[PDB]
Amino acid sequence: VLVQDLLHPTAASEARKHKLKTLVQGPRSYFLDVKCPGCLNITTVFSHAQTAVTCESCSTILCTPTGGKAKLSEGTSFRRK
């Protein structure tokens, strides 16, 4: 306070903020390849679905819509990319 680097804010105090009040704004959601080992292939899901994402071939389920982040269902794995 009184003199600080507004141009190079620290990654943490930057990280804790709001998605619009960061330096330059950008999302804080993410995508993921997801597999329920009944099948073999990997469907790409949105961390904040809304739509209860219907799996590829087997209409099994996958995730459920929520407040924000989707709840993935039962026995499933992932990765953020």
Partner 1 sequence: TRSSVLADALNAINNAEKTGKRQVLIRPSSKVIIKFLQVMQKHGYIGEFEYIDDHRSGKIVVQLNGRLNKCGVISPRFNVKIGDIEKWTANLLPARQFGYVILTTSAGIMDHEEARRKHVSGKILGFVY
Partner 2 sequence: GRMHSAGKGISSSAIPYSRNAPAWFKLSSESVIEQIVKYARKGLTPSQIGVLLRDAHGVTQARVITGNKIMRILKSNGLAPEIPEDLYYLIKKAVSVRKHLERNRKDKDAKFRLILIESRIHRLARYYRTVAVLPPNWKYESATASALVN
Partner 3 sequence: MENDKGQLVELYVPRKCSATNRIIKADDHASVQINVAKVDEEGRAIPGEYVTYALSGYVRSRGESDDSLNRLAQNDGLLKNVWSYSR
Nearer to partner 1, 23 or 39 (CB): 23
Site for RNA in 14-43 (CB under 7 A): 16-18, 21
Q: 40-79 mask for Zn ion (x: CB under 5 A)?
A: ---------------x--x-x-------------------
Distances (CA, A) of 1 to 4, 22, 73: 6, 18, 47
Name the one range near partner 3 by CB under 8 A: 7-15, 27-35, 40-48, 56-64.
Answer: 7-15
Q: Which residues bind Zn ion (CB under 5 A)?
A: 36, 39, 55, 58, 60
